[PDB]
Every structure is written in structure tokens, then in C-alpha cells.
Design a protein around this ligand. Structure first.
Ligand SMILES: *[C@@H]1O[C@H](CO)[C@@H](O[C@@H]2O[C@H](CO)[C@@H](O[C@@H]3O[C@H](CO[C@H]4O[C@H](CO)[C@@H](O)[C@H](O[C@H]5O[C@H](CO)[C@@H](O)[C@H](O)[C@@H]5O[C@H]5O[C@H](CO)[C@@H](O)[C@H](O)[C@@H]5O)[C@@H]4O)[C@@H](O)[C@H](O[C@H]4O[C@H](CO)[C@@H](O)[C@H](O)[C@@H]4O[C@H]4O[C@H](CO)[C@@H](O)[C@H](O)[C@@H]4O)[C@@H]3O)[C@H](O)[C@H]2NC(C)=O)[C@H](O)[C@H]1NC(C)=O
Ligand SMILES: Cc1nnn(Cc2cc(C(F)(F)F)ccc2CCC(=O)N(C)CCOc2ccc(S(N)(=O)=O)cc2)n1
Ligand SMILES: [Ca+2]
Ligand SMILES: [Ca+2]
Ligand SMILES: [K+]
Ligand code: NA
Ligand SMILES: [Zn+2]
Length: 805
């Protein structure tokens, strides 16, 4: 109930929300159906429109007008935005040459440069170039400020998850807004774009920027705008708030536009109808900037122009229907569209079985345009599993397609030509970032980056301490002139043991065999030196990774590779090796096919055994340092040490062997050598974080050998590929992966073919950031380079996406 009898006189767009039943005058009152009776009259004036004209200049103030052109308007803070242009001979901001903003030029009483976030829904990255001719204000922001060629959204590439990620620095699985539509089984409550349940605070986790600000003494504008408030009024409101007394005036503001998304759904991303929405947005930017210039704030305020996600061509005819795959389609609930999420229609149906649903949706039609996953099997880069609002069964939909339950769902709702939501590496989903102001750099292009990083930067811009988030603070320091955040590397928690030869061969009863009994002071000293670390400089190029948790592990050195061997998990945490451009691939010799050798530096008690693999009919093994890339026949024996062995399902060995035998040499050839760090990952609870020993759900049968959920590799070389990876003077180049350790290749519909036709495609799907691997392992890489730490942080957040431009 609302007592709409109260009044908005002197309260229009008040910043403090009043409580029911008292009536509201804030920028969301329309959305709650709670505005006072005179809100439209007082707060949504439209008379005479939004622009001064020559005949209005110096007029007698009429308080009815939407904006003013009277002499007093500048002191009142309520001129139309083009007042000084029309009435005082000034230029539009867009017509002024850009001039570097080396220091804030702020009026007296300003404690810090304000931040204005100008957010645009559905603004596809390529609009910045494709639309540049009709967007002059935006193009001036872009060219004169700091810009990225694109900014990567979060998955799913929907509006609410992305805007809340921008605001919090959190993945959707952590902030809780995992879709525009959601069911929470604990609450037994549904969230929708339309309706009142979304207003309940229990949905919204983490701490958004406006709360972070307020908690730390920095006043914020209200970020949200009811749809019926025209854009011109949103801009005038912001400019009026900026004219508040010092003690009342906010330091951070947002503008939101529902365009170009609204038209893009109707017309497709490049429909000829899209030019006009782009022009209108540019006009709005121009109003803001002219308005700021009038207030002498255009060289004081930091402006961020940012989007939530892009827009793809999608039409009704490109719809897959689950009714063409499932016998039982009435027994499921589907969240449909550009992603699918499936759960049981009834929790009382004991015949519901996810395994049967997954199998019925797997590789059934030759051109099938979606792929089913249990959520824990989704690419780790999506960070889309650790929330009870995310259904166990997920459908990843191909770009340009939809999934629906039945045909009647699609003609009882054609119309639309655009949509979004797909995998966040898809080029059409990419969006925009421009920063302009005293704190941003001048005429600077920065590489693409993820929207999860911006919360930290916005905090930097306002002098706030960020709440805990998924950004990597410092990785965006290169966007900033000042206010950089200078982190220190984390302290190493566990120091390594460096074992020597401590065990005789006969102390081992592992059930392993090897034909290695064939035998010199020249060369014996030389191999002892290899075991003491004499080649380590060649193979450990960026220092040893640091272990950031308490554990017991050994550094093991070899001619061709170095490893950090966990006594607790009975395998390496990491294995590091360098392959030059000139390296040769060789075979596993016949006489070594089933060779596994005890490691006399490591106790039988802290070793794997071959008998467990013999007895586990489902599980085989592979090697972290590949025997195919040994430097010599004698060095190859090291690759068959029990301390280099890891548990691998036969189906996965197909993938791993092809990576090791073919792809590593290919990358070394293409990149002028590579350094490879490979290892296991354990994430049985799919939280993106390293499992403890007591979280492990599967072991090699009858043993204490844990089974990894994933295998990673980090592949590093010189950005300047004219220098070899082992003699690189400058910036680095990286690509990495986190491959799911699955007992089948059902993910890959073409896996019956030669690995040349499917393995690399699998690997591209499971591309990762070094930072993702850090979270999953508790390791900290690149500790010893010649590079700036912030540069290394940028490198750790890089994602190799495999998309063209
Ligand atoms: C991305 O960045 C984020 C932010 O840094 C990372 O998320 C953090 O990860 C930590 C570990 O997973 C986690 O720490 C836990 O906090 C628990 C207290 O949590 C509440 O308070 C905080 C602070 O205000 C708040 O932020 C939390 O918010 C979550 O929950 C609400 C719902 O109430 C949601 O609205 C909100 O969206 C958010 O949900 C998300 O996180 C939760 C987990 O907290 C998930 O379950 C959701 O799916 C969703 O992803 C909370 O309101 C604290 O109780 C935990 O302590 C247990 O574990 C420690 C281990 O040190 C153990 O010693 C303790 O004994 C304790 O165990 C006991 O409880 C167990 C479970 O009931 C039980 O099994 C035991 O037997 C014990 O009784 C823990 O410290 C931190 O909360 C989140 N924060 C956020 C914002 O998500 C994220 O990891 C990063 N991602 C990556 C990939 O790097
Ligand atoms: C989602 C989301 N997450 N964070 N924001 C705010 C925001 C952030 C940012 C960021 F700076 F981060 F880029 C920019 C702009 C906004 C405002 C968006 C807005 O104005 N829209 C989308 C129309 C009304 O939307 C409502 C949504 C919920 C309620 S609620 N909570 O009352 O149910 C009301 C209105 N929106
Ligand atoms: Ca959107
Ligand atoms: Ca985990
Ligand atoms: K076996
Ligand atoms: Na297959
Ligand atoms: Zn949309």
C-alpha cells in the first residue's frame, strides 16, 4: 500500500529512498507504482522541450519549463544543455579540439573528480567503428581518451547478470544474478525481469559500487532509472545533482540507456533501422558533455562509456526444439532462448533422470545447434556452476540460434531479428569500454579485458577500497594516468624440499617394470648435475611457481623438465619444460611402452603404483612431461619416472597424447619456442577453487591416488616472436587451457575421426586465463621475470579466444 497523498515538492529525484507507506519521488518510484500524486507535474516537466532557442535566451524564468534559458539558469543548475551554445556564443563540446587533461580542473569545493558511468544496453563492440560516422561525441571520447577494441562480458551475456557484474566485480555465480529469469529452490521463489520479486534484496549478493561508496563516506547518485523517464531528463537530473552543495553532492553517478538493445532485438545488430538509435545515443552523450562544459566540469569528471553485452542475428526459424529429442518433454522445465537450463517439472517425479536427458540430447542430429552439459563440465572460463540457481543441466547454444521446449512456445509469444546470451567469447557478444577524464590516459588504446575488472578501477577512481571480488586488482593499471593500485606478490606459504637419492630400487614394491638395465665418469657427473638443477634455467623460465597454501612437496630436477611433486596428492602440482623451435619429436621406443620407473628421490610411501592402474579397469595413466619431446634417448628414461605419471582415462589419453605429440611441437614452431607448465586440477565441488584432500570424490581403485577433474597447461613465449622463448627481453605471450578429465569424448561429436579433426577444437573451447588456473591450484606463476608486476597481472588475465577480428 502507498499513501500517494504526500507531495514531491522540493523532492524531485531525491537520493534517499523513503519507506512505505509514504510516497516516493526517487528515480525508481514509477517501477514500484509508488510516486506521489504530483511527481509527473513537478518532476517530469516537458514544456518547451529540451533545447534553448534564440528567442528564449534571457527569458523570464517559467518554472513550468523542462529546462531553462533565463539568465539565472546557470546558478540554479537547470539550464537546457545547449544554453551556452545558443545564448552565449559557446561551442559544443564535440566541436572543440581535444586537449590532454593532465590534471583535474575542478571547481572549488570538489573533493575528488566525480565519476559518471554512461551505460548502454546491447552496444556491440563493433558499433564503435561501424557507427563512428553517426556518433561524433562517442568517437571523440574514444579517440581522445582511453579505449579498448572491445570488452568481454560475463556469461550468460544477458543484461541483468552483466550490469550487476559491472557493479560488483563478481561472476554471476557469486553475485547470484545468474540470468534474467531464475528459480531459487531454497527460497522457492522465481525472479523475472517483469514483476516485484526482483526487488527483494535476498537475490542480490556481493556489494555493488554505490554501497561500497556510501559505506566509505562517498555519496552516490541513484544508478537505476525507471523506463518511462526520458533520457533528456536523466541527463538533466545528473547535471542538477552535480550543482548540489558540497556536503550534499554525489561523487559517483550512472546513466542507463535501454538502446541500442531495444531496437537491436527488433531489427538485428546491423539492421538499417539501427542507425537512428545510435545517433540518438550520441546526441545524449553530447547533452551530457555540453552540460558538463557549462558547469566547468568537462576537464574534472571521469566518464566511462560502457556496455553490458552485444547483439547477434537470431530469428524464429533458427530454433532447436527439445520435443524433437526427448520422449518426456512434459516432465521438464526449460529456461529457453540463447542458453538452456533444464530441471524437473515436479520434484515428486522419481522417474526423472538427468543422465537419460543428457544422453538424448547428445550428438543426435548432424548439424545440431546446441550442446548439453552437466554444469560442472562447462568450460571453466565461464565460471558458471557454483550457485543453486544454476540448474544442473545446461545447454550451450550456437551463436545465431535458440533452443525451446516445443514449437508452440515460439509462435504463442516472426517478430525479432536479434538476441544475445551466448558464450562470452563469441565476437558478436563483445561490448564497449571508453574511459575519458583526468585520471584516464590520453589517446591510449589498451588490449581487450573482462568486465569483472572494472569494479576495482571504479573504486580506484573514487579512492575506495574494493570489496572482495573476481577482478585481479592491478591488471588494469595501464588504463590510468594516476590512482594506480600497486599490489605486492603473495607470500609463498610452503617451501619446497629438495630431495637427493635416498632409496634403493628394491625398497619399491609398486608392481611396475621397465627394461632400463643397460649402461662413464664424463657423462655420470653430467647427469648428477642435471638431477641437481643444472638445466633448470632453460626449463623454469619465470621462476618456480609459489605454493600459496600449506602442503608438503618436493622439487625434482631433470635434464628436460622440472616439477613440484606433491607428497599428499602423489603427483606433480606443476611440471615445467621448454621446447625450442628446433626441438625434435620422437617415439616411445618399443622396449619402453609399459615402462614405469621408481624415483629414488621419493619414498615408496609417497609414490603411485602400477598395480592400482592394472586393477582399475576404467583408469590408465599418462605423463606430464611428454616422453615424445625428450632431448636424447638417455634423457627419455626420466620421462617414465613414477613421479611424472598421472591418472588418465583412456578416452582422455587420446586428447592428451595428441596435445603432447603434435600440438606442443606445432606451437614451438609457430611461436619460436614455448615454455609449458602442465599439471592436474581438482575441483569436485565446482567452486573454481583448489580442492583440499578431503573434497576428493574419486581415487584410482583401491589406492590413495586422487583423480584430477581437469588437466591444465600454460604455454608461454616471447611477444616478439623474432626472439626465442628462452631468450626473450621484453613482454610475454601466453595461451592456456583447462581440459576436462572425462571418461568419454561425448562432448566432441566428431571424436570417432582422427584427433586432427577434433582435439584442437576441444582445447579452444576450454581455453583459460592463467588466473583461472591460479584459483584452481593455489599456485602463483610468473614470480621471476624482468617485467613490471602490473604487466604480469595483465598477462595472467589474458584469454586466448580463437575468434577472428
Ligand atoms: C570470486 O570472488 C568471490 C568474493 O571474494 C569469491 O567468493 C567468496 O569465496 C569464499 C569461499 O567460497 C566465501 O567464503 C565463505 O563465506 C561464508 C560466509 O558467507 C556469507 O558472508 C559473506 C560476507 O558478507 C557474503 O559475501 C556471502 O555471500 C554469499 O551468500 C549469499 C547467500 O547467503 C548470496 O546472496 C551471495 O550471492 C553469496 O553467494 C555465493 O557464495 C556462497 C558461499 O558463501 C555460495 O554458496 C553461493 O553459491 C554463491 O556462489 C555470505 O552471505 C563462510 O560461512 C564460509 O566458511 C566455511 O568454510 C570455511 C573455510 O575456510 C570453514 O573453515 C568454515 O568452518 C565454514 O564451514 C562451515 O559451513 C559449511 C557450509 O555450510 C559447512 O560445510 C561446514 O561443515 C562448516 O559448518 C566461507 O568463508 C565467500 O563468502 C565468497 N563470497 C561471495 C561474495 O561469493 C569467489 O570464490 C571468487 N571466485 C573465484 C573463482 O575466484
Ligand atoms: C541489473 C543491474 N545491476 N546493477 N544495476 C544498476 C546499474 C549498474 C550500472 C553499472 F555501473 F554497473 F554499470 C549501470 C547502470 C545501472 C542501472 C540499470 C537500470 O537502470 N536498469 C537496468 C533499468 C531498471 O532496472 C532495475 C533493475 C533492478 C531493480 S530492483 N533491484 O529494485 O529490483 C530496479 C530497476 N542494474
Ligand atoms: Ca542488456
Ligand atoms: Ca573446489
Ligand atoms: K587400468
Ligand atoms: Na564423441
Ligand atoms: Zn536484450
Amino acid at each position: 500500500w502507498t499513501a500517494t497523498s504526500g507531495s514531491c515538492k522540493g523532492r524531485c529525484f531525491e537520493l534517499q529512498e523513503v519507506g512505505p507507506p509514504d510516497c516516493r519521488c526517487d528515480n525508481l518510484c514509477k517501477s514500484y507504482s509508488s510516486c506521489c500524486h504530483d511527481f509527473d507535474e513537478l518532476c517530469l516537466k516537458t514544456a518547451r522541450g529540451w533545447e534553448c532557442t534564440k528567442d528564449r535566451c534571457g527569458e523570464v524564468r517559467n518554472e513550468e519549463n523542462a529546462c531553462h534559458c533565463s539568465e539565472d539558469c546557470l546558478s540554479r543548475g537547470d539550464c537546457c544543455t545547449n544554453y551556452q551554445v545558443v545564448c552565449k556564443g559557446e561551442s559544443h563540446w564535440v566541436d572543440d579540439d581535444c586537449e590532454e587533461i593532465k590534471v583535474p580542473e575542478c571547481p572549488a569545493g570538489f573533493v575528488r573528480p566525480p565519476l559518471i558511468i554512461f551505460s548502454v544496453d546491447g552496444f556491440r563492440a563493433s558499433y564503435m567503428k561501424k557507427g563512428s560516422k553517426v556518433m561524433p561525441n562517442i568517437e571523440k571520447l574514444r579517440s581522445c581518451g582511453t579505449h579498448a577494441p572491445y570488452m568481454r562480458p560475463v556469461y550468460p551475456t544477458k543484461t541483468f547478470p552483466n550490469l550487476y557484474t559491472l557493479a560488483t566485480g563478481l561472476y554471476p555465480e557469486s553475485h547470484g544474478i545468474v540470468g534474467n529469469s531464475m528459480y531459487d529452490p531454497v527460497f522457492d521463489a522465481s525472479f523475472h525481469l517483469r514483476g516485484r520479486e526482483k526487488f527483494n534484496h535476498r537475490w542480490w549478493g556481493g556489494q555493488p559500487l554505490w554501497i561500497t561508496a556510501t559505506k566509505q563516506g562517498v555519496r552516490a547518485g541513484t544508478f537505476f532509472w525507471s523506463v518511462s523517464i526520458p533520457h533528456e531528463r536523466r541527463i538533466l537530473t545528473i547535471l542538477q545533482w552535480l550543482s548540489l552543495p558540497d556536503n550534499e553532492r554525489p561523487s559517483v553517478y550512472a546513466f542507463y540507456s535501454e538502446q541500442p538493445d531495444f531496437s537491436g532485438h527488433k531489427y538485428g545488430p546491423f539492421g538499417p533501422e539501427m542507425t537512428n538509435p545510435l545517433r540518438e545515443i550520441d546526441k545524449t552523450v553530447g547533452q551530457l558533455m555540453d552540460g558538463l562544459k557549462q558547469l566547468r566540469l568537462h576537464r574534472c569528471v571521469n566518464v566511462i562509456f560502457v556496455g553490458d553485452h552485444g547483439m547477434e542475428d537470431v530469428t524464429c526459424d533458427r530454433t532447436e526444439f527439445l520435443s524433437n529429442y526427448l520422449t518426456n518433454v512434459d516432465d521438464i522445465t526449460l529456461v529457453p532462448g540463447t542458453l538452456g537450463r533444464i530441471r524437473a517439472k515436479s520434484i515428486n517425479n522419481s522417474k526423472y533422470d538427468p543422465k537419460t536427458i543428457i544422453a538424448a540430447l547428445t550428438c543426435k542430429k548432424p548439424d545440431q545447434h546446441f550442446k548439453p552439459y552437466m554444469k560442472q563440465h562447462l568450460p571453466k572460463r565461464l565460471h558458471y556452476a557454483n550457485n543453486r540457481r544454476i540448474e544442473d543441466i545446461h545447454l550451450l547454444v550456437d551463436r545465431r540460434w535458440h533452443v525451446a521446449r516445443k514449437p508452440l512456445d515460439v509462435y504463442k509469444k516472426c517478430f525479432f531479428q536479434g538476441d544475445h546470451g551466448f558464450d562470452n567469447k563469441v565476437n558478436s557478444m563483445q561490448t564497449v569500454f571508453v574511459g575519458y577524464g583526468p585520471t584516464f590516459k590520453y589517446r591510449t588504446k589498451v588490449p581487450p579485458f573482462e568486465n569483472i575488472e572494472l569494479y576495482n578501477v571504479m573504486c580506484d577512481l573514487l579512492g575506495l577500497k574494493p570489496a572482495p571480488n573476481n577482478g585481479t586488482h592491478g591488471s588494469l593499471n595501464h588504463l590510468l594516468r594516476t590512482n594506480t593500485f600497486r599490489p605486492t606478490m603473495p607470500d609463498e606459504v610452503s617451501r619446497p624440499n629438495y630431495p637427493g637419492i635416498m632409496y634403493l630400487q628394491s625398497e619399491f614394491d609398486l608392481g611396475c617394470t621397465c627394461d632400463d638395465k643397460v649402461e662413464n665418469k664424463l657423462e655420470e657427473l653430467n647427469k648428477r648435475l642435471h638431477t641437481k638443477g643444472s638445466t633448470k634455467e632453460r626449463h623454469l623460465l619465470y621462476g618456480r611457481p609459489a605454493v600459496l597454501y600449506r602442503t608438503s612437496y618436493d622439487i625434482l630436477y631433470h635434464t628436460d623438465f622440472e616439477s613440484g611433486y606433491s607428497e599428499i596428492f602423489l603427483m606433480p602440482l606443476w611440471t615445467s619444460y621448454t621446447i625450442s623451435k628446433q626441438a625434435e619429436v620422437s617415439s616411445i621406443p618399443e622396449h619402453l611402452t609399459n615402462c614405469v620407473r621408481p624415483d629414488v628421490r621419493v619414498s615408496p610411501g609417497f609414490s603411485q603404483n602400477c598395480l592400482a592402474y592394472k586393477n582399475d579397469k576404467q583408469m590408465s595413466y599418462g605423463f606430464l612431461f611428454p616422453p615424445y619431446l625428450s632431448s636424447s634417448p638417455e634423457a627419455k628414461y626420466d620421462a617414465f619416472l613414477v613421479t611424472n605419471m598421472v591418472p588418465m582415462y583412456p578416452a582422455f589419453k587420446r586428447v592428451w597424447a595428441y596435445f603432447q605429440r603434435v600440438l606442443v611441437k606445432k606451437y614451438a614452431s609457430e611461436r619460436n619456442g614455448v615454455n609449458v607448465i602442465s599439471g592436474p586440477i581438482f575441483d569436485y565441488n565446482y567452486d573454481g577453487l583448489r580442492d583440499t584432500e578431503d573434497e576428493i570424490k574419486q581415487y584410482v581403485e583401491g589406492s590413495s591416488i586422487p583423480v584430477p577433474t581437469h588437466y591444465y597447461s600454460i604455454i608461454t613465449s616471447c611477444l616478439d616472436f623474432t626472439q626465442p622463448a628462452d631468450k626473450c627481453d621484453g613482454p610475454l605471450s601466453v595461451s592456456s587451457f583447462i581440459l576436462p578429465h572425462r571418461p568419454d569424448n561425448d562432448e566432441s561429436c566428431n571424436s570417432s575421426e582422427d584427433e586432427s579433426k577434433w582435439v584442437e577444437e576441444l582445447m579452444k573451447m576450454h581455453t583459460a586465463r592463467v588466473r583461472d588456473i591460479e584459483h584452481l591450484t593455489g599456485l602463483d606463476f610468473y614470480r621471476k621475470t624482468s617485467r613490471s608486476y602490473s604487466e604480469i597481472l595483465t598477462l595472467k588475465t589474458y584469454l586466448h579466444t580463437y575468434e577472428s577480428e
